[PDB]
Amino acid sequence: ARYLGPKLKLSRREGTDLFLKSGVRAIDTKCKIEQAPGQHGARKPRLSDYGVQLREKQKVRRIYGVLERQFRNYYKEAARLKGNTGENLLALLEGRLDNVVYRMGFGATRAEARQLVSHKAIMVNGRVVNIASYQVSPNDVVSIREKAKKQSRVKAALELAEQREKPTWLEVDAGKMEGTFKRKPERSDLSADINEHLIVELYSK
Amino acid sequence: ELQEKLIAVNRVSKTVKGGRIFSFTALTVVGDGNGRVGFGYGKAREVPAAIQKAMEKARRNMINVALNNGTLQHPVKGVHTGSRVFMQPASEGTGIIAGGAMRAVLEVAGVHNVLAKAYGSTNPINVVRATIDGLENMNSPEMVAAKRGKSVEEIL
Amino acid sequence: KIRTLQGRVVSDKMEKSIVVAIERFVKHPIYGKFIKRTTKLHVHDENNECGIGDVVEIRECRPLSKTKSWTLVRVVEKAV
Amino acid sequence: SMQDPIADMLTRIRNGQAANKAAVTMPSSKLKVAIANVLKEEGFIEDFKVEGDTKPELELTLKYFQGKAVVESIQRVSRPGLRIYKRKDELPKVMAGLGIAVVSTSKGVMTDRAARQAGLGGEIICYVA
Amino acid sequence: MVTIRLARHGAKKRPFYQVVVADSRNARNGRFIERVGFFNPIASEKEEGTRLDLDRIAHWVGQGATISDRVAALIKEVNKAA
Amino acid sequence: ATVNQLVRKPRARKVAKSNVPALEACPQKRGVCTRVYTTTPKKPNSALRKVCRVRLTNGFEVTSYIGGEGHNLQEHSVILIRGGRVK
RNA sequence: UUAGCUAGUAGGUGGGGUAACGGCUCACCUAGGCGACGAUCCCUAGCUGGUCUGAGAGGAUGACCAGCCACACUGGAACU
RNA sequence: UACCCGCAGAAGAAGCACCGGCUAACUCCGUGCCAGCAGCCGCGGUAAUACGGAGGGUGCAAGCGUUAAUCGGAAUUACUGGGCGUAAAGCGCACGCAGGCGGUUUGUUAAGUCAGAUGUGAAAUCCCCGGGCUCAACCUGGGAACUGCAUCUGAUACUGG
Ligand SMILES: [Mg+2]
């Protein structure tokens, strides 16, 4: 129930950055960033209205690695809630446990953040949480437990967090390798390449 | 800043003694993201050529539409040539809910959160003429305060 | 005070029994039109005293007969 | 023939707007005045002039704005073949409340937004927008 | 006749009981009489485990109700704790 | 469309039937092969469509298209049909 | 393209009967009773909370849980 | 049993469907109205993006497809929310009962109608706010709702009497 294929192949499909590797080696030095994979990947078609709504939703899933049914459950939850549904939807996406570990930069990629939660190396409010898709409540702490603090892939990811923009809604520590979920973020606190007014309409045919 | 969307690519024909003269026709709409929008139906002997005539029609002859913040102000229906089309404001953060040409014409109209439904003919020429007529006579609370000789709070 | 009803005296031929029809005036559950609907009842009169075509006032009572569980209380506008 | 004076009235209002007349007259009724004394108050007509002794005749003054009309819509909700009785919660909002709905309740004739503040429903006559 | 017994309403291996006024000839899915409270044997900490209207219960014992074994135990032990 | 006519007579919503009645609202039904043969189709297409006349469970005698290319079908053989018309 | 239906039927009086009222049963009177707001007859069917869809209106639906009902080889009958 | 530590290695653990348009995703080769394909329009009659194979790609996922079965889309029975000059559709007209419908004005009535209040509308379910299981599914607390019906007290504009 995971994607296991080539990561940058998905980047070549959507054409934009998906942050799927550590960014140490330059991304364009690993793939033609503006050719879709395979034979007929150079020629850009007159892409239709249906496709760009699909490609937008296929972007956001492949941003966070979320399969369709479980992603649809987020849509059902966000539609049940109040206000802007896409802002509610992104909050659910930011509510993911394996997201915040990448947002705290403890794992270099989200998949490198996910394996840690899979291999039980995390403590949330002092409690180990095996589920990567767990929804993070506000004002909680996410601490590396002391079995796998000594992994070299932890502290090298901390430097990659220094390379990235530091998020705002995360009171993150370094010496204890812990953090604190301050508050929920905004639409504005995330990127602008994700349209609110498309992923709603795709699931509202 | 006037964003532009083609609507229809189409191939009609005249018939002469020699045969059939195919001619490509195109429907477009322009709009600024504010309450200014204009459609255009062009026609030529060529697909990338008739669209420019369709745009040039639409760049002229605009219409001024009283929007609300990100939506309509009150639900209303729209008709042109058997193409009865109902539309409706919605809550914030729900997107445009419409199909066909109506998705395009409201997006260049700069609304963001609507409810809409087409009845009868879904012919994209007359279905967008019905959208415009409903958006045209949709009027402000401020105008009907001035029309009725009152204020906003004398209406609420 | 008592749960009483009125209606139209339809039949008075059989002894110690009158047939009374009652208008219930009810909405249609779909179309919303208010319909005159008729509920007839076999009412035990005494004395066979009721004139035919009359407004009576009735009361639910203990079961008088096989088809009759209704007894009048009084009569308004007995004439034709 | 004559199945309603009210539907006669609203259509005579409706056809007078497009005819660009300044004065629409008709025989008057007690219920007709009770409606005509709302739309002046609500600002959809300018004047009504009830006159007539043997038979009262209501004469109206149509309100025109910027050349064109004011009455953008005028309807009938409770028709004589099908009556409408809605409670205080099911009172409508004509043109999202920008227009008005004439309701007759036990407290005479008023508008719906007054009837909501009166907190009591009744018979919805017509829609005026 | 009138009973007050424990009614299994929960998942497998994790029981939860609606201790209600019921009938001693009816069942657990089926007919109770009146819902007078609940009980969790997996009542953890920081949560109540037995919230019963202990006065309408006295109304029905006044009508001659029948009290079960744990129900007689737990109504005592509530009053032996509250 | 007058509501008095609507009172005296309700709107008769039209009742639709199945085009595949022999299954009798089942997903698949067992059948027995009766005759296996070919059939020329109608005008726009020209082929020999392999097809079998089938005795069913409920005694119905129907025809059902053999999909694919090539088969090992005999008469007096137990088969299973899913539906779908051939145009 | 089911229009007439009903003789204990319908009502009364009296007797009997049942825990209970009542053609419940019987006797004797009366001729009533029902139906075009569908009686009658035919076809199909356990019913509801609900379930599924639908923006709603509605539509379909009654496994699982409930509430009721009916049945227990078939047809019968009482017994306790 | 729940849960807790050791152990060992990337180890033992991914597949269906699809690419003519409808609808996201194409080339090559076989094939020649044959073999076939097919929800619809429709493809194959030697150069097939529609057949078959390959490559590549799209969609999903421990499942993926097909069939069955119900609503939606379908306003395609149109209460909400249709039409009848010629696209289906106003009886050949007239009469008229039941039927439905009703000018104006005053009282009366309060039936309808509206308002209020009691009773009931079981639980479950759904909704809302919570809680609990590492989360989720699930369980569960409280609430709202159960659109009704009955009764009582009004109300009097309209519709009735
Ligand atoms: Mg929202």
PDB file of N, CA, C and O in Angstrom, chain E residues 4-6 19 52 67-76:
ATOM      1  N   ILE E   4     -33.025  -5.229  36.019  1.00  0.00           N
ATOM      2  CA  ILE E   4     -31.931  -4.294  35.793  1.00  0.00           C
ATOM      3  C   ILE E   4     -30.668  -5.116  35.609  1.00  0.00           C
ATOM      4  O   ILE E   4     -30.076  -5.575  36.592  1.00  0.00           O
ATOM      5  N   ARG E   5     -30.249  -5.305  34.367  1.00  0.00           N
ATOM      6  CA  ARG E   5     -29.151  -6.227  34.135  1.00  0.00           C
ATOM      7  C   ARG E   5     -28.133  -5.561  33.219  1.00  0.00           C
ATOM      8  O   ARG E   5     -28.334  -4.445  32.745  1.00  0.00           O
ATOM      9  N   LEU E   6     -27.021  -6.257  32.998  1.00  0.00           N
ATOM     10  CA  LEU E   6     -25.902  -5.739  32.218  1.00  0.00           C
ATOM     11  C   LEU E   6     -26.004  -6.164  30.758  1.00  0.00           C
ATOM     12  O   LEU E   6     -26.145  -7.353  30.457  1.00  0.00           O
ATOM     13  N   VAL E  19     -26.232  -0.626  31.675  1.00  0.00           N
ATOM     14  CA  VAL E  19     -27.056  -1.152  32.755  1.00  0.00           C
ATOM     15  C   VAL E  19     -28.340  -0.341  32.824  1.00  0.00           C
ATOM     16  O   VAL E  19     -28.351   0.829  33.221  1.00  0.00           O
ATOM     17  N   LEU E  52     -24.905   6.504  36.948  1.00  0.00           N
ATOM     18  CA  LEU E  52     -26.261   6.001  37.094  1.00  0.00           C
ATOM     19  C   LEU E  52     -27.133   6.992  37.841  1.00  0.00           C
ATOM     20  O   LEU E  52     -26.725   7.572  38.849  1.00  0.00           O
ATOM     21  N   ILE E  67     -33.146  -6.468  41.281  1.00  0.00           N
ATOM     22  CA  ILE E  67     -31.794  -5.972  41.075  1.00  0.00           C
ATOM     23  C   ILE E  67     -30.843  -7.146  40.901  1.00  0.00           C
ATOM     24  O   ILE E  67     -30.869  -8.106  41.680  1.00  0.00           O
ATOM     25  N   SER E  68     -29.985  -7.071  39.884  1.00  0.00           N
ATOM     26  CA  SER E  68     -29.055  -8.149  39.590  1.00  0.00           C
ATOM     27  C   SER E  68     -27.899  -8.166  40.585  1.00  0.00           C
ATOM     28  O   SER E  68     -27.846  -7.397  41.544  1.00  0.00           O
ATOM     29  N   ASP E  69     -26.941  -9.057  40.329  1.00  0.00           N
ATOM     30  CA  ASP E  69     -25.869  -9.295  41.288  1.00  0.00           C
ATOM     31  C   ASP E  69     -24.834  -8.185  41.255  1.00  0.00           C
ATOM     32  O   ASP E  69     -24.536  -7.572  42.286  1.00  0.00           O
ATOM     33  N   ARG E  70     -24.254  -7.930  40.079  1.00  0.00           N
ATOM     34  CA  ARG E  70     -23.305  -6.838  39.959  1.00  0.00           C
ATOM     35  C   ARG E  70     -23.969  -5.495  40.137  1.00  0.00           C
ATOM     36  O   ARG E  70     -23.334  -4.570  40.645  1.00  0.00           O
ATOM     37  N   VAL E  71     -25.232  -5.381  39.727  1.00  0.00           N
ATOM     38  CA  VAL E  71     -25.970  -4.143  39.902  1.00  0.00           C
ATOM     39  C   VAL E  71     -26.137  -3.827  41.380  1.00  0.00           C
ATOM     40  O   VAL E  71     -25.913  -2.690  41.804  1.00  0.00           O
ATOM     41  N   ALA E  72     -26.467  -4.831  42.191  1.00  0.00           N
ATOM     42  CA  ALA E  72     -26.464  -4.637  43.633  1.00  0.00           C
ATOM     43  C   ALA E  72     -25.066  -4.398  44.174  1.00  0.00           C
ATOM     44  O   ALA E  72     -24.912  -3.691  45.174  1.00  0.00           O
ATOM     45  N   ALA E  73     -24.044  -4.958  43.531  1.00  0.00           N
ATOM     46  CA  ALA E  73     -22.686  -4.707  43.985  1.00  0.00           C
ATOM     47  C   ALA E  73     -22.252  -3.291  43.647  1.00  0.00           C
ATOM     48  O   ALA E  73     -21.727  -2.574  44.504  1.00  0.00           O
ATOM     49  N   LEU E  74     -22.514  -2.850  42.420  1.00  0.00           N
ATOM     50  CA  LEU E  74     -21.899  -1.616  41.951  1.00  0.00           C
ATOM     51  C   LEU E  74     -22.655  -0.392  42.446  1.00  0.00           C
ATOM     52  O   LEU E  74     -22.068   0.682  42.602  1.00  0.00           O
ATOM     53  N   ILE E  75     -23.960  -0.527  42.693  1.00  0.00           N
ATOM     54  CA  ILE E  75     -24.685   0.576  43.312  1.00  0.00           C
ATOM     55  C   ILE E  75     -24.213   0.770  44.741  1.00  0.00           C
ATOM     56  O   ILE E  75     -24.075   1.910  45.212  1.00  0.00           O
ATOM     57  N   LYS E  76     -23.911  -0.329  45.430  1.00  0.00           N
ATOM     58  CA  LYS E  76     -23.281  -0.249  46.741  1.00  0.00           C
ATOM     59  C   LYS E  76     -21.918   0.422  46.658  1.00  0.00           C
ATOM     60  O   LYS E  76     -21.642   1.382  47.386  1.00  0.00           O
TER      61      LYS E  76
END
